[PDB]
Design a binder for these strands. Structure first.
Length: 48
RNA sequence: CCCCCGGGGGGCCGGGCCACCCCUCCCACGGCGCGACCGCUGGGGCGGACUGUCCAGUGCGCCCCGGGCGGGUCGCG
């Protein structure tokens, strides 16, 4: 009751890094399918 | 006020403009050439992330570019 005022914590500038995983792009998403199919074949003639 | 045959015709002197040939402004429009500002799509380096049942591949960030493409705005010839 004698000091209800709130003093925010001082905001320090941060190193500005990224802990999260960025979203994959279309070119990458589309190229992975080409590798998955190609690797599925180049693994199939090894059995052949 | 004159002139040619009472009726038809011809002039009076100044000024500016267009006709032709010379020169030259600003503007409009179109064309050709050039330069500047924006847009789009090849290289290299750096940094980082990711993918692929062979070491290969794919964006993104920054920077430098040789460009290519195209239109707008601006400025010339």
């Amino acid at each position: 009751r004698e000091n209800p005022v709130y003093e925010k914590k001082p905001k320090r500038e941060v190193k500005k890094k990224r802990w999260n995983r960025p979203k994959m792009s279309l070119a990458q998403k589309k190229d992975r399918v080409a590798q998955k199919k190609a690797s599925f074949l180049r693994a199939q003639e090894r059995a052949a």
